[PDB]
Amino acid sequence: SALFEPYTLKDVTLRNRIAIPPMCQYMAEDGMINDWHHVHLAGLARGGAGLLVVEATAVAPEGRITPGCAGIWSDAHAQAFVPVVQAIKAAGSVPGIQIAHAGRKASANRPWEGDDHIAADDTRGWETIAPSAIAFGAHLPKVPREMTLDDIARVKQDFVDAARRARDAGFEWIELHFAHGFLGQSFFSEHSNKRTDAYGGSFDNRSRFLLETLAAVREVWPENLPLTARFGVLEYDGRDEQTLEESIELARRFKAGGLDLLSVSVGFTIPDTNIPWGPAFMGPIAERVRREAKLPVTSAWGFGTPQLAEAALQANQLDLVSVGRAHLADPHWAYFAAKELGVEKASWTLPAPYAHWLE
Ligand SMILES: Cc1cc2nc3c(=O)[nH]c(=O)nc-3n(C[C@H](O)[C@H](O)[C@H](O)COP(=O)(O)O)c2cc1C
Numbered sequence: 098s099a100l101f102e103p104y105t106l107k108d109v110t111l112r113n114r115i116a117i118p119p120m121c122q123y124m125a126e127d128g129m130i131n132d133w134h135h136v137h138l139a140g141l142a143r144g145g146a147g148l149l150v151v152e153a154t155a156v157a158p159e160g161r162i163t164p165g166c167a168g169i170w171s172d173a174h175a176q177a178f179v180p181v182v183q184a185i186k187a188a189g190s191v192p193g194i195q196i197a198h199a200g201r202k203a204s205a206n207r208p209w210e211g212d213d214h215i216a217a218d219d220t221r222g223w224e225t226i227a228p229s230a231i232a233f234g235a236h237l238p239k240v241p242r243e244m245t246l247d248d249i250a251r252v253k254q255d256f257v258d259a260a261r262r263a264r265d266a267g268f269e270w271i272e273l274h275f276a277h278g279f280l281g282q283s284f285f286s287e288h289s290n291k292r293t294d295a296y297g298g299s300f301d302n303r304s305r306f307l308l309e310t311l312a313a314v315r316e317v318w319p320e321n322l323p324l325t326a327r328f329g330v331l332e333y334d335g336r337d338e339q340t341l342e343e344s345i346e347l348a349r350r351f352k353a354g355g356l357d358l359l360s361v362s363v364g365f366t367i368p369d370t371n372i373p374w375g376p377a378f379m380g381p382i383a384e385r386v387r388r389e390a391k392l393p394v395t396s397a398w399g400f401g402t403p404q405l406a407e408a409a410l411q412a413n414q415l416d417l418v419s420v421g422r423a424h425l426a427d428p429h430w431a432y433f434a435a436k437e438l439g440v441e442k443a444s445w446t447l448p449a450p451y452a453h454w455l456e
Contacts (some may be wrong), residue, residue, distance in 0.1 A: 098438045099410035100403065104147065104417060106357050106393070108321040109269050111147030111191055111417070114410055115431050118360070118397050118419035119195035119272065119327075121152045121166060123207040128155060128168020130177050138181050141424055142188035145431030145446035148417065149190045151178070153197035153274050156255040160198030160280065163207050164221045169196060170255065175262035182267040188448070193270030195327065196259040198252060200280030201227040201241035201289065214239040226252075228284045228306070229291040235368040249296060252280065253310050260314045264322075271318055273311065273326040278365040281307050282329050285347065286366040304347050308354060315355045323357040329364030330386055333372045340364075341382070348390035358393040358416065361386050374398070377405050384414040395419045401426075403434035 104111040124133035134151075142149050155161040155168040168174050178194070185192040199205075203225045204215050213236040215222035226248060227241035244252070256273070263271055275281030283289035284306040290297045296305050311326065318324050328351075330344035331337045348359055361383040363372060376399035383396040393416040400406045401423030409415045423430045432455075435443035444455035 098407060098435075098440055100407050100418065100434060100438060101440050106323045109191055109323055112189060113145070113147040113431065114417050115146040115406070115434065116148040116395055116417040116419045117141055117146045117150060117424050118395075118421050119150045119152045119274075120421055120425070121162065123163055123165030125165055125167040128158065128161065128166065128170060128174050130167050130181070134167070135181050135184065139184035139188065140428045142185040142190035142192075143448055143451075144424070144427075144429040145435070146190055146420075146424070148193055148270060149185055150193035150195055150270065150272055151181075151268075153195050153199075153279075154259070156196050156198050156259040157252065159203060159223050159226060160200070160252075160255070162199040162203055162279075163205050164215075165207050166199075169194075169259045169262050172262065175266045178263075178266040178268070186267070191269050192267065193272060193323075193325075194263050194268045195272040195274050196256060196263065197274035198255070198280040199225075200278075200283050201225050201231070201233055201239070202237055202278055204239065205237065212236060227280065227289065228297060229289060231289060231291065233278065233289075233368065237368075243292075246294070249306060253306075253313050256310050257313045257317055261317045264318060268322075270323045271314075271325065272360060273314065275307050276327040276329040276360070276362040276364065278329070278367070281310070282364055282366055285328075285344075286332070286364060288332075288334070288367045300343055300346070304350065307347070308350055311351060311354050311356065320355075324355055325358045325360060326351060326356055327360035327362055329362045329366065330382060332364040332366055333370045334367065341385070345386055345389045348386055348392055352390055352392045356392065358395065359386065359390070360419065361394050361396045376400075376402060377409055380409050380412075380414040384412070387414070387416075393417075397421055401430065403437040406434065407438055
């Protein structure tokens with residue numbers, strides 16, 4: 098099976114092509130992770146996936162999505178990850194982390210606590226920042242503060258510090274969160290970026306925050322460990338061919354700047370869109386980016402059906418298959434997939450204290 102073939106990227110070898118993508122847990126306190134995350138992540142690693150990417154972890158307090166988001170904006174925050182990293186490694190999975198800044202979509206409630214911007218008089222809330230003072234709208238009506246050049250320098254440095262911290266905590270894989278309408282994505286999109294300085298207007302200017310952040314992170318992130326990013330390559334906003342073309346150009350510049358793999362997603366930059374949700378619906382777009390930027394890719398949404406994951410790999414649409422919600426439902430999804438695909442000794446996807454009994 099293609100799904101259970103190993104994958105080598107730089108010095109890191111994944112035992113199979115199953116990636117667990119970043120999934121916010123909303124269980125941290127002032128950015129500090131705790132035994133929620135420890136057990137969640139170690140349990141997933143033991144389930145058999147080759148790569149486990151820790152949830153969006155804020156590079157700065159105001160870059161959290163919610164009051165429950167993880168952070169890595171101090172060395173104490175980073176140190177909290179060390180035992181979890183060590184547990185993921187003990188289980189034979191590769192520990193990754195997504196470092197993030199939520200931009201104008203920050204200061205929101207947890208998804209089961211309203212999922213909306215925090216009310217003005219709620220002591221938990223904070224001012225958001227963005228390339229331009231324009232609200233997302235809908236359930237995220239707060240108008241962000243327009244970033245100064247010093248803010249841009251500071252946030253880039255926060256990404257650098259976060260990457261340094263992730264390195265020193267023992268992560269073997271990093272993902273820059275430039276997708277899903279958060280700060281990076283919003284610098285790229287003309288919907289959200291109305292700047293007239295070096296960081297807006299033209300394609301080069303809109304790309305600049307993302308490329309400069311990648312280059313700055315590259316200085317401190319080891320060359321022998323995969324350097325990746327998530328990026329929304331279209332919005333389903335009636336501008337898809339032009340947006341895709343630009344996104345693919347940016348992917349080429351990412352590759353030239355040392356990016357090893359791109360997690361291809363949707364932008365979610367604005368609410369007024371028409372996304373054609375369906376099983377593996379991003380497969381063909383991921384394939385186009387892979388082909389036209391000549392860059393390894395992953396993607397997500399509905400690949401928890403093992404045969405569909407297998408088909409996407411065999412069609413060379415993807416290099417890794419990201420499987421999210423199916424792993425919340427069943428942390429041992431990789432074992433289920435091995436069984437479904439008829440892999441020999443499927444139960445040994447799991448560690449011996451499980452595998453022996455399930456043969
Ligand atoms: C609980 C939850 C939290 C998520 N948090 C993030 C995250 O931290 N960063 C990210 O880029 N995507 C996040 N996503 C998107 C997932 O990585 C993934 O793309 C999405 O769930 C689709 O894959 P699936 O159909 O296999 O669940 C999250 C989704 C879920 C379900």
